[PDB]
Amino acid sequence: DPARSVRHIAIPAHRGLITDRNGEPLAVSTPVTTLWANPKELMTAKERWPQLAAALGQDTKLFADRIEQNAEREFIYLVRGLTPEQGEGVIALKVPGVYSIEEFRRFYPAGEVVAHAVGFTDVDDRGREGIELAFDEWLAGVPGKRQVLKDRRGRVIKDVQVTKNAKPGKTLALSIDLRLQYLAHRELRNALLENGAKAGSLVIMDVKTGEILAMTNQPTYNPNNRRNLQPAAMRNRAMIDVFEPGSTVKPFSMSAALASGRWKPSDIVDVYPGTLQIGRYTIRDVSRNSRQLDLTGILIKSSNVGISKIAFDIGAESIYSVMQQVGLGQDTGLGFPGERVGNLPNHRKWPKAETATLAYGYGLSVTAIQLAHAYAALANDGKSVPLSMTRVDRVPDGVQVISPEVASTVQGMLQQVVEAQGGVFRAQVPGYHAAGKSGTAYRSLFAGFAPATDPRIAMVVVIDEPSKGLVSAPVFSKVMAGALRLMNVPPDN
Ligand SMILES: *C(=O)[C@](C)(CC(=C)O)NC(=O)Cc1ccc(O)cc1
Secondary structure (H helix, E strand, C coil): CCCCEEEEEEECCCCCCEECCCCCEEEEEEEEEEEEECHHHHCCCHHHHHHHHHHCCCCHHHHHHHHHHCCCCCCEEEEEEECHHHHHHHHCCCCCCEEEEEEEEEECCCHHHHHHHHCCECCCCCECCHHHHHCHHHHHCECEEEEEEECCCCCEEEEEEEEECCECCCCEEECCCHHHHHHHHHHHHHHHHHHCCCEEEEEEEECCCCEEEEEEEECCCCCCCCCCCCHHHHCCHHHHCCECCHHHHHHHHHHHHHHCCCCCCCCEEECCCCEEEECCEEEECCCCCCCEEEHHHHHHCCCHHHHHHHHHHHCHHHHHHHHHHCCCCCCCCCCCCCCCCCECCCCCCCCHHHHHHHHCCCCCEECHHHHHHHHHHHHCCCEECCCECECCCCCCCCEECCCHHHHHHHHHHHHHHHHCCCCCHHHCCCCCCCEEEEEECCEEEEEEEECCCCCCEEEEEEEECCCCCCCCHHHHHHHHHHHHHHCCCCCCC
16 A cells, blocks of 8 residues: 555536526526545544534444445545535534535526526536536536645645646526516416416517527426426426427418418318318318308318318428428427427328328427427518527527518418407407417417517417316416516507
8 A cells, every 4th residue: 555645636617607698697606515534534533433423413333334334445425515604513523534625516596497498417516407418518617637645544735736727617698588487487387277287388489589588397396406306397398398289380381372372361261061081081170160261260260171171272292391491390409408309290292181180280299499489480570590598699690481471471360360259369468469379289289479560579388288278378468468568579559
């Protein structure tokens, strides 16, 4: 066994602050007191063990067995993450081989409100979920290194040289607006209670900048206290759960219809008697007392038959192209851990059955983020701005995916879906014109944007297994109203 040893050892770096877009702290690295021991030194001071064990709330015998078992180690932890005053009280004992150190632990000041977005670090302050993992290299910084001389029992008797100072991690400003985040969190929670639903998501996006202003899910968890958390509660459902968007994609089917040269909003489709047979398969409407409907009526009534007949006429290829160009079934580029791409199925040739099902959003799988990004493109006069969960100062060039005239026309149809007789009146936003589309899948969807005249915000509300299909619209109304007021958006109604 050696009389001495030398070791280059790490100087830990301070992990970068995560903030919201206005500098509100979301993840902060705080100094904690850690008590450790050198067993080889402890072994010389056995009469001190019971007082030390007692000061660590350990049974004397369990503690003594642990030191005896680790007799040839030179390091063990006693307890991590104390108060300065707490460790002081144990160092006050002056037990040979017992040492306090100040290390870094994450605190999450908004806790459950932004847990799924921010994620969290492990005991070693390494990113393990969410933004913490996705931007770990950015946030982590670079350990320093220093040389120590140790005696026969491995205690440090000299600091020899620092070869490298630690470099702190970098601040990261998310796209999240904490004020919008708290409003969405509260309103989604209250909606689940009032509707006896057990899960849900709500996304708010800036249609001009591609920024995710809010992303909240239920259930959630306190990242400051992860004791015995149900794994369901840690799911960022908005990014990692896929669902069938159903009626919510009909505005993309209509976009292809209006681009085709073959359809204007005043054109009529006969949907009588509210069913349509396709070989063995029958398309069924929810309401079945219509004959002639104009294209705006097809959206207000959300006629499956009506959108199917339009799709037969223009062809599935036109609709598939719009859906792909607005990002359905496509990588968002966000690199969020576990983020899903979902599924926009293709065919070399589209028979009638597959054509219809595409047109009314059956057999597709999207995330709430993808559906919000699609609505954002439609709201932004047909131009898709790339998504960001970090603050955007320099907005990248968007891609024109729907002609501005067609997008403008579809916006107007979606304003009627909210505002017109027979429409989703509970999605109406006080002081503003709003636009959007419901969907019903045991699952309630609402997607939309406001103000309808000069749109600023897209929003998706998803409510899982309510206990009564239109539980999502009033949530859109409340959260859109609050978000537009917080953003000083001038009323347009
Ligand atoms: C849209 O909200 C709706 C009119 C609701 C409905 C239950 O028919 N249409 C669809 O969601 C389209 C659709 C129909 C059947 C199915 O299995 C998935 C999607």
